[PDB]
């Protein structure tokens, strides 16, 4: 499978800078223009930038011209986005996508493959890793409460991703403290509460907080 894996997102001050990366595998990277598309929290999609296969040409949205600089390293199958003079409006998930074939006239197959994205938050506040607290009670519910973290995002899985059915991981809410709090729950057979362990796997990359909490 063609795959794109983005990295490099996190928190930075207004005015500050960060670089994003996107590693491609499964295709001839240098053959294709490569594109960045972003999504501000609860908004639609917005195109940011593209760069032809060879790197002959670059293309930018009006609002990012000059302060953002796209690049690629074809020898490492890697796209880059240098994001300088950061603004509140640049807070978004940033996706990379494979774009047109760079034949004398390029051939276009859509934005056929997209990365999983990387979240960028532009704020004057500081990083804070979450606490993880258990949510203890023919069906039982259990959960974890991931409280008091900044910035977004956090990921939650259960039993290292084995447990998928019945899981609800909720949109975080921003408290008045300016910190996020999220819950993740699962419904499980009540019968097996003594014969089976349930562990929430919490990751908050911006703080390098990776926690596994057994819920009893």
């Amino acid at each position: 499978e063609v795959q794109l894996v983005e990295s490099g997102g996190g928190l930075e001050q207004p005015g500050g800078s960060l670089r994003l990366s996107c590693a491609g595998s499964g295709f001839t990277f240098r053959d294709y223009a490569m594109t960045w598309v972003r999504q501000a929290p609860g908004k639609g999609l917005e195109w940011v930038s593209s760069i032809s296969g060879s790197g002959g040409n670059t293309y930018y949205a009006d609002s990012v011209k000059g302060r953002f600089t796209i690049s690629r390293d074809n020898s490492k199958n890697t796209l880059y986005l240098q994001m300088n003079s950061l603004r509140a409006e640049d807070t978004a998930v940033y996706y990379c996508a494979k774009d047109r074939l760079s034949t004398i006239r390029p051939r276009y197959y859509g934005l056929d493959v997209w990365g999983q994205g990387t979240t960028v938050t532009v704020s004057s506040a500081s990083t804070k890793g979450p606490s993880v607290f258990p949510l203890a009670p023919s069906t039982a519910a259990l959960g974890c409460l991931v409280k008091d973290y900044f910035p977004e995002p956090v990921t939650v899985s259960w039993n290292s991703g084995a447990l998928t059915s019945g899981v609800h991981t909720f949109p975080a809410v921003l408290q008045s403290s300016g910190l996020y709090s999220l819950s993740s729950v699962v419904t499980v057979p009540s019968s097996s509460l003594g014969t089976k362990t349930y562990t929430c796997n919490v990751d908050h990359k911006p703080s390098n907080t990776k926690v596994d909490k057994r819920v009893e």
Partner: protein, 216 residues
């Protein structure tokens, strides 16, 4: 900039019924005969956008029979011949005729189903959290329909206001229901000044209350 406008923004559909999402562009997207530079994308909740259709009517790799695109120049239609529950999500059009690529505002496909009352669960604060100085009490509404439900916290039967936040998942891809989490946040001191903690969930004129006694 080419302006793309989508109709409707919200599409409630019964599984098995057709759906049709329309896109108008402010400039013609017909580059050459058979080459209309319009794409359709689907973004499911908590996932990346995925390509459905490119160049107006070409179905991308691994996309079901059920999806098709048509149109020319300034008017385009994505069609779903028979909607399934797993189709829930946001649909965007995008032109790739010119940079910047530009997106429609998004259409949220919502699945219509029968009413389902929530399984309700209440979670007291963990002893681990209490040790910090704060109590979060959590109320889970599991798998309900429709979206509209009212959560009312009650502390020793006094109705709480302004000290709770809630959030809701997107419709489930299998059962088309929502879930909701509500958090009541008290100081440890306030939490310990009261006995009965109650979450009352109302749908229509029916109200279901789960509670616990801090003491017991």
């Amino acid at each position: 900039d080419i302006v793309m406008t989508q109709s409707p923004l919200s599409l409630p559909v019964t599984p098995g019924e057709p759906a049709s999402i329309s896109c108008r562009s402010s400039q013609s997207l017909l580059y050459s005969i058979g080459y209309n530079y319009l794409d359709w994308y689907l973004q499911k909740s908590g996932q990346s956008p995925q390509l459905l259709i490119y160049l107006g009517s070409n179905r991308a790799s691994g996309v079901p029979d059920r999806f098709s695109g048509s149109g020319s120049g300034t008017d385009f239609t994505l069609k779903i011949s028979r909607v399934e529950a797993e189709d829930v999500g946001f649909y965007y059009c995008m032109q790739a005729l010119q940079t910047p690529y530009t997106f429609g505002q998004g259409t949220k496909l919502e699945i219509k189903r029968t009413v389902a009352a929530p399984s309700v669960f209440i979670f007291p604060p963990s002893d681990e959290q209490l040790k910090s100085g704060t109590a979060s009490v959590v109320c889970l509404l599991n798998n309900f329909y429709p979206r509209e439900a009212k959560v009312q916290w009650k502390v020793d039967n006094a109705l709480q206001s302004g000290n709770s936040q809630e959030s809701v998942t997107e419709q489930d891809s299998k059962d088309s229901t929502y879930s909701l989490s509500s958090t009541l946040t008290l100081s440890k001191a306030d939490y310990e000044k009261h006995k009965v903690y109650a979450c009352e969930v109302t749908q229509g004129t029916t109200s279901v209350t789960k509670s616990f006694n801090r003491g017991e």
